[PDB]
Amino acid sequence: HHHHMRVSFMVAMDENRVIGKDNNLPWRLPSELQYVKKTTMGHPLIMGRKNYEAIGRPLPGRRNIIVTRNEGYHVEGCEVAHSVEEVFELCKNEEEIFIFGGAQIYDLFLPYVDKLYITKIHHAFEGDTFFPEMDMTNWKEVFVEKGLTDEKNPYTYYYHVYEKQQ
Numbered sequence: 001h002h003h004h005m006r007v008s009f010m011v012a013m014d015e016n017r018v019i020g021k022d023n024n025l026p027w028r029l030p031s032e033l034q035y036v037k038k039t040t041m042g043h044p045l046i047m048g049r050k051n052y053e054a055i056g057r058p059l060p061g062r063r064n065i066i067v068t069r070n071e072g073y074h075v076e077g078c079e080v081a082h083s084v085e086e087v088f089e090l091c092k093n094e095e096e097i098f099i100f101g102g103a104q105i106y107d108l109f110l111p112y113v114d115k116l117y118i119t120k121i122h123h124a125f126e127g128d129t130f131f132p133e134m135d136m137t138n139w140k141e142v143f144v145e146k147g148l149t150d151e152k153n154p155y156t157y158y159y160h161v162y163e164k165q166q
C-alpha cells in the first residue's frame with residue numbers, strides 16, 4: 001500500500017496554531033520565507049487550491065502541485081491533483097515532497113507525514129485558519145534554531161524540525 005517518497009510538512013504557526021487570516025498570512029517575515037525557499041528548493045510543493053491562489057503564481061525551481069476537487073481546474077506552470085493518491089502517483093519517484101498548506105491540505109496529508117518543518121512564532125495573532133493538532137509521541141526534534149529578529153522581521157520565532165521514529 002506504500003508510497004516511497006518522504007512526506008514533509010512545511011508550516012509556520014503562532015502560539016495558538018494560527019496560520020492564516022482572511023485567506024492570507026497574518027504576519028510578514030521575509031527572513032522566514034528565505035528559510036522556506038532554501039529548504040524547499042528543488043522539491044515538489046503540494047498546496048491547497050486556496051493557498052495556491054493567495055500566492056498567485058508558480059514558485060520557481062519546484063514542481064507546483066495544486067490540490068482541488070475541481071476536475072476542470074488548470075494553471076500554466078503548475079500540476080493539478082484531486083486526491084492524496086493522485087499526488088502519490090505524480091510524485092512516485094520523488095525523494096521528498098513538501099506539504100505546503102493550508103489547513104485543509106495539512107489535514108488531508110496528516111496520516112502520512114514523516115517529517116515536520118515547523119516555524120513557531122511567539123505571538124498570538126488574530127486568525128481564522130489553524131494548523132491541525134498532532135501527537136508527537138514517537139517523534140524527535142532534530143533541529144532547532146532561533147529566527148532572525150530585526151526591523152524587517154519584528155517577532156520572535158524559532159525553526160523546528162521533527163522526524164517521526166517510524
Ligand SMILES: NC(=O)C1=CN([C@@H]2O[C@H](COP(=O)(O)OP(=O)(O)OC[C@H]3O[C@@H](n4cnc5c(N)ncnc54)[C@H](OP(=O)(O)O)[C@@H]3O)[C@@H](O)[C@H]2O)C=CC1
Pocket residue numbers: 010011012013018019020021022023024025047048049050051052054067068069070081082083084100101102103104105106108129
Ligand atoms: N503560515 C503558513 O505556513 C501557511 C498559511 N496558509 C494560510 O492558510 C489559508 C488557506 O488554508 P485553507 O483555507 O484551509 O485552504 P487550502 O489551501 O487547504 O485549500 C483548500 C482547498 O483545497 C482543496 N481541497 C481540500 N480538500 C480536498 C480534498 N480532500 N480533495 C481534493 N481537494 C481538496 C479544495 O479546493 P477546491 O475548492 O478548488 O475544490 C479546497 O477549497 C490561507 O490563509 C493561507 O494564507 C497557507 C499555507 C501555509
Ligand SMILES: CCc1nc(N)nc(N)c1C#CCc1cc(OC)ccc1OC
Pocket residue numbers: 010011012024025032033036051054055059100101117118119
Ligand atoms: C509564512 C511563510 C511560510 N512559512 C513556512 N514555514 N511554511 C509555509 N508553508 C509558509 C507559507 C505560505 C504561503 C505563501 C507563500 C509564499 O511564497 C512561498 C508567498 C505567499 C504566501 O501566502 C500569501
